[PDB]
Design an enzyme around this catalytic site. Structure first.
Site, mmCIF file in Angstrom:
data_model
loop_
_atom_site.group_PDB
_atom_site.id
_atom_site.type_symbol
_atom_site.label_atom_id
_atom_site.label_comp_id
_atom_site.label_asym_id
_atom_site.label_seq_id
_atom_site.Cartn_x
_atom_site.Cartn_y
_atom_site.Cartn_z
ATOM 1 N N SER A 43 -5.431 68.759 -6.473
ATOM 2 C CA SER A 43 -4.721 68.467 -5.752
ATOM 3 C C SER A 43 -4.469 66.373 -5.437
ATOM 4 C CB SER A 43 -6.201 68.397 -4.319
ATOM 5 O OG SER A 43 -5.362 70.169 -3.420
ATOM 6 N N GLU A 141 1.246 75.718 -5.684
ATOM 7 C CA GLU A 141 -0.299 76.259 -4.991
ATOM 8 C C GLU A 141 -0.549 77.788 -5.552
ATOM 9 O OE1 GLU A 141 -3.072 74.563 -5.000
ATOM 10 O OE2 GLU A 141 -2.501 72.690 -4.194
ATOM 11 N N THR A 210 -8.799 63.292 -3.463
ATOM 12 C CA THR A 210 -9.495 64.425 -3.823
ATOM 13 C C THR A 210 -8.520 65.533 -5.058
ATOM 14 O OG1 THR A 210 -10.529 65.835 -2.665
ATOM 15 C CG2 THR A 210 -11.727 64.207 -3.294
ATOM 16 N N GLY A 211 -9.190 65.826 -6.228
ATOM 17 C CA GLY A 211 -8.717 67.184 -6.446
ATOM 18 C C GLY A 211 -9.751 68.099 -7.006
ATOM 19 N N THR A 212 -9.707 69.734 -6.524
ATOM 20 C CA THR A 212 -10.642 70.490 -7.383
ATOM 21 C C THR A 212 -9.961 72.082 -7.848
ATOM 22 O OG1 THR A 212 -12.109 69.910 -5.690
ATOM 23 C CG2 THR A 212 -13.155 71.909 -6.856
#
Length: 266
Positions: A43, A141, A210-212
């Protein structure tokens, strides 16, 4: 030598691959660890995506209503799920994409930028326009979070994404009004409380995205300011691919990397 040894120990203890970049300033050297290795965006791409959409349109475009359908929801989308019947404005989509990482919001922004087929290319092209010739977005996504380790698709580098965020927040990629919208959404997300924010003292300002993802992917990109206003850009990226697609991400790895950086910069 000391900082490289510190980052290596983080990798061993977390059973992870860690990437770090902090650009040089007039009084500080760049900090770099695997900084030119590719890591999935996850993200993190949503920050420059919102910038691209801000850049290409007047402020009144924030009030453009976007209609969409239940078929468009194929990813974690806590905001967009609630508004299928009514649509959401571009501004609402930006807020959702930054503040919650709403996946459908990002997909709709991609389509605003480049149409239903061209959005990932258009997003990548915005990065090209900012002189990032390395990063690439190839999927939307949720697939962009799921590419196998070693695949270049949907990757950036700590070095590349730090220089992009620098231009967006510290530089003049955006005019002041649009820049402030982006920074305000980032200042208001909190998904990032346990990442770079947790490595910097409270009297440092931190804004982040953030990104996960799969394979234990956990990233954070931030701009920080010292208590006297001195800015730095911090990109931390990680994965735990050896555990397979369902490896647990480790936010605390990112907090520790950020703590290491903060200690150098303080």
């Amino acid at each position: 030598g000391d900082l490289a040894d510190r980052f290596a120990e983080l990798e061993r203890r977390y059973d992870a691959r860690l990437g770090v970049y902090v650009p040089a300033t007039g009084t500080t050297a760049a900090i770099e660890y695997r900084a030119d290795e590719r890591f999935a965006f996850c993200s993190t791409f949503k920050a420059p995506l919102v910038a691209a959409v801000l850049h290409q349109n007047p402020l009144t475009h924030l009030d453009k209503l976007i209609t969409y359908t239940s078929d468009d929801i194929r990813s974690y989308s806590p905001v967009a799920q609630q508004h299928v019947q009514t649509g959401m404005t571009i501004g609402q989509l930006c807020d959702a994409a930054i503040r919650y990482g709403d996946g459908t919001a990002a997909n709709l922004l991609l389509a605003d930028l480049g149409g239903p087929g061209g959005g990932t290319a258009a997003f990548t092209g915005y990065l090209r326009s900012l002189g990032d010739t390395v990063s690439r977005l190839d999927a939307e996504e949720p697939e962009l979070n799921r590419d196998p380790p070693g695949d270049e698709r949907d990757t950036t580098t700590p070095h590349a994404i730090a220089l992009v965020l620098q231009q967006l927040v510290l530089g003049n990629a955006l005019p002041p009004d649009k820049r402030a919208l982006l920074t305000d959404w980032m200042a208001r997300n909190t998904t990032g409380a346990k990442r770079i924010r947790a490595g910097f003292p409270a009297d440092w300002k931190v804004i982040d995205k953030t990104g996960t993802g799969d394979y234990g992917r956990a990233n954070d990109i931030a701009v920080v300011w010292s208590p006297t206003g001195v800015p730095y850009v911090v990109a931390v990226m990680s994965d735990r691919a050896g555990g397979g697609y369902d490896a647990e991400p480790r936010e605390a790895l990112l907090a520790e990397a950020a703590t290491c950086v903060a200690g150098v910069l303080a």
